[PDB]
């Protein structure tokens, strides 16, 4: 019955369900980032030679560079039957608050983890900004998740690559002592009560230890029918707003402004609640957060289910055996080169007694002298001089090093090209667009376009807080994948250039060239050129 008990039951079920895949992914990360000698006893006792001759890393680097040269980002397009510019405001907001360095860094981190381990992720959080807000004194930012394979535990009963059907998800935060102090200060926790949680990392292969602090955030989704109010907009049309969104703040301020309630309908929607949890207690219970979806976006490589067991893979899992074999063979051969007697003659001491300074290595004599006689045996027995055999790399070592390297090269071919990985990243970006649209409709001031201008219908309560009013005509645009532009001006420039590429040299070519000059940056010369283009475009009507 305990809320803590239910949260821990769900978390433990998911943690035990995702055990093999997390271990393999952590193995891939450690193999491809720290070292390929995944061992502790041999390299800490009876120290031998352990080289590291990589053949997999250049492959990983090439894949990362290929996925870096082709950026992908959300692109909102109007729905069918909606106004042709229904996605302009949403696209502008998205390009405003996703142009920052943190968004690009989060996407790059997720992509690299997708290539190496098999899964990555990022998060979409909301903050309050006064200096440069995207809207409503609020900003939406994208934050990275490092080692998502072990730090993000998903609902076990999800069979979708983008995890849209996850009813809950737990994210484990490991932070320094100062990080914990700042986390508690920001979240109104008790900084003196040091928290604990199931440690995600493993820090095996000692690497000293991991002085950290673990807490968890548990997001859950509740889909239910809740009350909505149908009003009569004093300007025009009938707007629909949710009862919970205006429950107390402006439930009478709408009537004061002039809205008259017409009907009351019950509409089914999703809500997301975050809980800060530790292994023994709950800290924040069900803090409602903006949006209809869990704000965590996962990115996958080769993903599937074998027998109700999720399996994901990158490019490193199948090269490990061959790479380890190549490293071992090269270490053995290096041992052979070092600890081996080299080619020198075999003598009896009586053969060179008294002539030892000739064979030391100097070149001061024209020949080598040998003894001929023994007083008891008469003469030195005849036998051709023997020399210690030269060191040799065995045919086994040579053949197997070549075969191991060839096998690694054969298996480290992602595709023929990273098309499938970029398509999985496109799926992740479509989920990102959906989540961002929901959070925008929740916290941002979205104006409506009327064909009679953009109208913002808002009001402020008695506590000086402004309550945003979003009508139910919100999902007017869907999500596609497009090039990553830093601003709507850049997007329009790209569109104009693309159209000009296919337009032949008629009159629309002149039209589009003048448009390109209109939508350019400003200096002095480019200023005069853009002013001339404006004059021409205005004068031709």
């Amino acid at each position: 019955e305990n809320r803590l008990e239910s949260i821990l039951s769900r978390f433990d079920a998911d943690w035990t369900a995702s055990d093999e895949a997390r271990r393999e992914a952590k193995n891939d990360l450690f193999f491809s980032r720290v070292s390929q000698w995944d061992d502790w006893l041999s390299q800490y006792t009876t120290l031998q030679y352990r080289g590291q001759f990589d053949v997999v890393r250049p492959v990983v680097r090439k894949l990362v560079s290929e996925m870096r040269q082709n950026p992908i980002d959300v692109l909102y397009r109007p729905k069918d039957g909606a106004r042709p510019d229904a996605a302009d405001v949403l696209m502008g907001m998205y390009r405003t608050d996703m142009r920052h360095n943190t968004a690009k860094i989060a996407v790059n981190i997720a992509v690299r983890e997708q290539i190496e381990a098999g899964v990555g992720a990022w998060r979409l959080v909301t903050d309050y900004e006064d200096q440069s807000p995207t809207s409503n004194n609020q900003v939406i930012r994208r934050e990275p998740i490092h080692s998502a394979c072990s730090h993000v535990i998903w609902d076990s009963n999800s069979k979708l690559m983008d995890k849209s059907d996850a009813r809950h998800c737990t994210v484990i935060h490991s932070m320094s002592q100062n990080g914990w102090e700042d986390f508690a200060e920001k979240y109104d926790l008790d900084a003196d009560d040091i928290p604990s949680f199931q440690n995600p990392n493993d820090w095996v292969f000692p690497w000293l230890t991991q002085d950290t602090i673990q807490i968890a955030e548990f997001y859950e989704v509740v889909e239910k029918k809740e009350t909505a109010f149908i009003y009569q907009d004093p300007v025009t049309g009938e707007p629909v707003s949710y009862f919970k969104r205006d429950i107390k703040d402006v439930i009478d301020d709408l009537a004061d402004s002039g809205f008259i309630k017409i009907a009351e309908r019950q509409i089914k929607r999703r809500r997301v609640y975050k809980s800060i949890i530790t292994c023994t207690a709950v800290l924040k219970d069900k803090q409602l957060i903006a949006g209809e979806h869990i704000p965590i976006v996962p990115v996958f490589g080769e993903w599937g289910f074998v027998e109700d067991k999720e399996v994901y893979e990158g490019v490193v899992r199948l090269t490990k055996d061959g790479q380890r074999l190549r490293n071992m063979i090269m270490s053995f051969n290096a041992d052979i080169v070092a600890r081996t007697p080299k080619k020198k003659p075999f003598f009896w001491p009586e053969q060179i007694a008294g002539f030892e300074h000739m064979y030391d290595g100097n070149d001061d004599y024209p020949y080598y002298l040998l003894n001929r006689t023994d007083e008891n045996s008469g003469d030195l027995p005849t036998q051709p001089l023997a020399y210690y055999e030269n060191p040799e790399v065995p045919q086994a070592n040579a053949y197997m090093l070549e075969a191991a390297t060839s096998a690694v090269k054969e298996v480290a071919t992602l595709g023929v090209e990273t098309y499938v990985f970029q398509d999985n990243l496109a799926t992740a970006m479509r989920r990102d667009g959906e989540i961002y649209q929901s959070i925008v409709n929740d916290i941002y001031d979205v104006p409506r376009n009327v064909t009679i201008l953009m109208a913002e219908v808002v009001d402020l309560a008695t506590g000086e807080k402004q309550v945003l009013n979003d009508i139910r005509g919100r999902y007017e645009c869907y999500t596609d994948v497009g090039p990553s532009f830093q601003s709507m001006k850049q997007q329009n420039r790209a569109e104009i250039l693309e159209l000009l590429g296919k337009t032949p040299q008629g009159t629309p070519e002149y039209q589009l060239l003048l448009l390109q000059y209109f939508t350019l940056l400003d200096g002095k010369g480019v200023e005069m050129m853009r002013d001339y283009a404006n004059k021409q475009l205005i004068q031709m009507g």
Binding site: L41, Y44, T45, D192
Partner: protein, 421 residues
């Protein structure tokens, strides 16, 4: 042989006492050149005189103090070797179990210090399962003895049961022939209530000690003695050195059978009201903290007498007992049977003074040292590793430095049921 490395967990320990006890971390350089001790003043008490003519009768000022120090580090020094393969996963298992055992040790010494420096003693002549609602009676007796003495309980109060008596209290609740909300909770879960008889935090602790009976008997105060509230005194060189206020050394006829933790009471002396100095009807209880010599002991409530004529008025302002010792008073021993303890305290009485071990310095090269946060208890130690190629081995050491201090022993108590015969 086939083998799997899933651990079969066998221990689940819990730390309420060291979680509730506040952690104090004074500045390290000051402790280093002050010998790891620091003094705190004690809330001031004023004397009062009524009359019109008060010539020459002006008092002085007296403000007492107590000292908090630390002990010696507790370690997990274990050597690393080759041995077998699973040594390297038993390595991480050993680190985790070491941190867990260190937390347990902090708890054990917190509970033992509370149970051995707790001045207030609430005895019962029978067990807790005998009469109805007598677990509530026991908790209420604790609360009432804290209330009558006018002790400070602003930051909170706590009452820890041992599991046997907790189960007996729950049994008392569930045998009630009526189910409301408290009996239903005590039935479905074992919990009696989170707050009982006034205390705002009632728990159970599995690490509470057992206070063995003291065979001492026929012991009387030897010589009339008077103990005076002082703030400092001169050493042989004339330097004024500070005096800790929670300790009095008394001379008895013979200290045969007593030991640190014994609860005694002098025949005739009664508690006071501290602030109002009204005589209570409850006998004053003391706890011995050290047996020095064969005829002396150290008891933690310093018995400042109200009727002591040799005290200055400002010193009498600190009186907590109505009568001094009288060379013949019997020394009754309160603990007469072996019994597991229930322990209550005002939440600010026990603290844990913590200091760092700067082994991360440059002066320690060759060894690798990190900080080591312990969960449960809010403490920090160091984890140090040193590899020795000479035997081609290595050493690992987890060191935690702290000290448990009872600043107000008069606020810590103990509950002893079944003290018959």
């Amino acid at each position: 042989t086939l083998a799997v490395d899933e651990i079969i967990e066998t221990i689940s320990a819990i730390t309420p006492m060291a979680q509730k006890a506040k952690k104090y971390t004074p500045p390290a350089a000051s402790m280093q050149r002050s010998s790891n001790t620091i003094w705190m003043p004690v809330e001031q008490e004023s004397p009062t005189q009524e009359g019109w003519d008060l010539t020459d009768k002006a008092t002085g000022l007296l403000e007492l103090n107590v000292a908090v120090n630390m002990g010696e580090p507790d370690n997990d020094f274990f050597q690393l070797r080759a041995d077998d393969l699973r040594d390297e996963t038993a390595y991480r298992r050993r680190i985790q179990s070491a941190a867990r055992k260190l937390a347990n040790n902090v708890e054990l010494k917190v509970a033992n210090m509370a149970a051995e420096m707790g001045s207030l003693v609430i005895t019962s002549p029978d067990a807790i399962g005998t009469n109805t609602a007598d677990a509530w009676n026991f908790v209420a007796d604790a609360e009432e003895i804290m209330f009558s003495r006018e002790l400070n309980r602003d930051m909170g109060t706590s009452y820890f049961f041992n599991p046997q008596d907790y189960k007996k209290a729950g049994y008392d609740l569930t045998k009630r022939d009526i189910f409301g909300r408290i009996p239903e909770e005590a039935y479905r879960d074992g919990t009696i209530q989170r707050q009982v008889a006034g205390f705002d935090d009632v728990l159970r602790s599995p690490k509470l000690p057992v206070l063995t009976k003291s065979t001492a008997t026929g012991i009387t105060v030897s010589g009339a003695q008077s103990f005076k509230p002082v703030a400092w005194q001169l050493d042989n060189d004339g330097n004024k050195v500070n005096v800790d206020n929670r300790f009095a050394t008394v001379t008895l006829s013979a200290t045969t059978g007593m030991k640190r933790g014994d609860k005694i009471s002098f025949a005739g002396v009664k508690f006071l009201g501290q602030m109002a100095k009204n005589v209570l009807a409850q006998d004053a209880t003391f706890s011995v903290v050290r047996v020095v010599d064969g005829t002396h002991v150290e008891i933690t409530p310093k018995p400042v007498a109200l009727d002591d004529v040799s005290l200055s008025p400002e010193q009498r302002a600190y009186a907590n007992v109505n009568t001094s010792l009288a060379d013949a008073m019997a020394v009754n021993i309160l603990n007469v049977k072996d019994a597991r303890t229930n322990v209550f305290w005002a939440d600010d009485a026990i603290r844990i003074v913590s200091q760092p071990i700067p082994a991360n310095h440059e002066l320690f090269a060759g060894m690798k040292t990190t900080s080591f946060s312990i969960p449960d208890v809010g403490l920090n130690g160091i984890f140090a590793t040193q590899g020795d190629i000479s035997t081609l081995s290595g050493l690992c050491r987890i060191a935690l430095w702290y000290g448990v201090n009872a600043t107000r022993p008069e606020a810590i108590g103990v509950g002893l049921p079944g003290q018959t015969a």
